[model samples]
Target: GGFGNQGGFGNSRGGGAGLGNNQGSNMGGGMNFGAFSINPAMMAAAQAALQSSWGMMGMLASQQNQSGPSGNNQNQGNMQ
Candidate 1:
């Protein structure tokens, strides 16, 4: 059946705040452990943590949209 779906959700939120201030904290907090195990328990923990980080990131994104990508868009320009 190949139900063991690894690397499935990995690419879900890569392009967003991949290089922001909170990005490090975000990954460090929850995504790391959950990503390593890739299970339902960690999955829920990861999502909960991600949700918290996502909310904070949303606020930062708003400010970035107004002023500039102080942390988020720095790499974006170089990529272009």
Candidate 2:
């Protein structure tokens, strides 16, 4: 109950998957995650990556998402 009831560890701060919307009202700023620092340059790079990845996913998602014999032309093994 301690970890569960105490702000849920990252429901309000540094936690897995919850980026940009936490940080004690610093929803828009730089973040230094120990070894790596996230600033405007990183944001730009991330944005570019997101855009490119989104386009790539759009092109491949349909085929990749298919199942029932061929995931994308050939059968892909399940992950461990």
Candidate 3:
């Protein structure tokens, strides 16, 4: 004899980055955005874009680092 029971479970997670609760000083309560004042959603999107660009630069740097000493020597002449 045996007992049989079954259950299913699932989990999901997501996140984003943005300026926090300290952006109030950057506005004068009248900043306009096509008839709408600046708000949290706009701030979040702008911050996300900034983060994405930084991430892209990091990826580029990682690729360059993997190209080794020969690659660095080739690019040295372009360095100021």
Candidate 4:
């Protein structure tokens, strides 16, 4: 999954940009209609407008590897 050009290192919000845009935009560009039907079509339309995120997991994990809970053991006191 962590390959080249697939999603890059900067835009990891959803494998890329605008792909995981789960904002209110999914609601018919921010306008839910049909009052409150809760039908399949309504849901489908909603899905198309909004987006989500999760690809950031990889980037988060990578950050932990550097100076995570292990603590920054560099030049503290040089204990022998």
TM-score of each: 0.13, 0.16, 0.13, 0.14
TM-score of 3: 0.13
Reference-based lDDT, residue 14, model 4: 36
Query: Least accurate stretch of 10 residues (summed lDDT) in model 1?
Result: 71-80
**TM-score (C-alpha) between model 1 and the true structure:** 0.13
Q: Which regions of candidate 1 fall more than 4 Å away from where they truly are?
A: 1-41, 45-63, 66-80
- lDDT per residue for candidate 3 within 1-80, as digits (tens), equals 44333343332663543334332134333232432346333321121111112242234635322221232222223323
Residues 6-53, candidate 4, lDDT per residue (tens digit)?
A: 323544453432333242233344343453346434222221223433
Clashes of each: 0, 0, 0, 4
lDDT of 3: 0.31
Candidate 2 Cα outliers beyond 4 Å, as residue runs = 1-6, 10-15, 20-24, 29-80
What is the Cα-based lDDT of residue 75 in candidate 4?
A: 36
Q: For model 1, state the Cα shift of residue 61 in Å.
A: 17
lDDT of each: 0.34, 0.32, 0.31, 0.36
lDDT of 2 by residue, 1-80 (tens): 54212244545555454443232232323333333455323221111111112232245634333223233343436444
TM-score of 2: 0.16
TM-score of decoy 4: 0.14
lDDT of 2: 0.32
lDDT of 1 at 24: 22
Candidate 1 C-alpha lDDT tens digits along 1-80: 56423343237564432333343233444443322344344232321223232343245625322332243322223221
